[PDB]
Design a protein around this ligand. Structure first.
Ligand SMILES: O=C1Cn2c(Cl)cnc(c2=O)N[C@@H](Cc2ccccc2)CNCCCNCCc2ccccc2CN1
Lengths: 276, 11
């Protein structure tokens, strides 16, 4: 039942911008998300001091996916352990406690990709977090699907648009509610030529070109959040990427970079079946 | 400016 939203696909209602994504299959400068628009959205919350840590996504009733750098990044003295964080699921408002809507879960264990490259370019920027207890699904809490080879091959194409969501900074201040922006996947050569950072096959970049007019990008605080696409074949939402890195936010000629979820699915599956 | 969350989750 993954990728089918209770408030949209389940009742055959479409959100305001999913049509834009469909038409392409041939957070800075975003907008407020609709209620229940991203039911798999997860907020990584630091306990003390209480603050926004990162974004993340719900992939099952006990597993949450995020960016490895959200938990481990020596250059900025970041090395969080299970008890330093909490996961808040089903949220819309950034700062308020959404009583009777959001659910807060404690972390049982964190698993960071063994070959996550924090020293150089954040290659394989992915991590899994197992919750202590399963979270109850609801109209605002629902898992997103993970792509198989076919889905990745057909949707991960230059020009095809995905959707990024998060409570991160609005500019390179803070948003009142969850932000959303649809961005087109960019050709590999263009991504490469836009930066001096070495790009790997475990990454892809997205965003509009300077001559395209439209804008939008992820920013500080959005890390770990999902880059999703709605399959035109089975109408389910798939998480194709994880907000990973960028140079500035929404700069002309620059693009946000995302962890290529399918490329690392082997690892994801290995972790899940081995550890329950 | 984060609203305080119930104690059960912080314990
Ligand atoms: O901050 C991060 C992750 N992140 C980390 Cl841990 C370190 N350095 C970042 C970066 O982006 N950007 C710097 C270039 C760089 C990329 C990869 C490894 C080392 C240096 C260059 N300077 C730091 C920029 C920090 N704000 C980046 C905001 C932004 C924009 C688009 C997508 C995700 C994000 C947030 N993600």
């Amino acid at each position: 039942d993954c990728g089918l939203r209770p408030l949209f696909e389940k009742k055959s209602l479409e959100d305001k911008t999913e049509r834009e994504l469909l038409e392409s299959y041939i957070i800075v400068e975003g907008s407020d998300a609709e209620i229940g628009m991203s039911p798999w959205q997860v907020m990584l919350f630091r306990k003390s001091p209480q603050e926004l840590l990162c974004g993340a996504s719900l992939i099952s009733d006990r597993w949450v996916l995020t960016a490895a750098h959200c938990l481990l990044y020596p250059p900025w003295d970041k090395n969080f352990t299970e008890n330093d964080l909490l996961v808040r699921i089903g949220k819309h408002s950034r700062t308020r406690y959404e009583r009777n809507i959001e659910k807060i879960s404690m972390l049982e264990k964190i698993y960071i990709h063994p070959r996550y490259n924090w020293r150089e370019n954040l290659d394989r920027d992915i991590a899994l977090m197992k919750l202590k207890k399963p979270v109850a699904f609801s109209d605002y809490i629902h898992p997103v699907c993970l792509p198989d080879r076919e889905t990745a091959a057909s949707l991960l194409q230059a020009g095809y648009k995905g959707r990024v969501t998060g409570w991160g900074n609005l500019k390179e201040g803070q948003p009142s509610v969850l932000q959303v922006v649809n961005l087109p996947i960019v050709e590999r050569p263009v991504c490469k030529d836009s930066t001096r950072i070495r790009i790997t096959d475990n990454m892809f970049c997205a965003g509009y070109k300077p001559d395209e007019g439209k804008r939008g990008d992820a920013c500080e605080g959005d890390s770990g959040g999902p880059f999703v696409m709605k399959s035109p074949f089975n109408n389910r939402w798939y998480q194709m990427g994880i907000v990973s890195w960028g140079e500035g936010c929404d700069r002309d000629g620059k693009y946000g970079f995302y962890t290529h979820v399918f490329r690392l699915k082997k690892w994801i599956q290995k972790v899940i079946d081995q550890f329950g | 400016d984060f609203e305080e969350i119930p104690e059960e989750y912080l314990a």
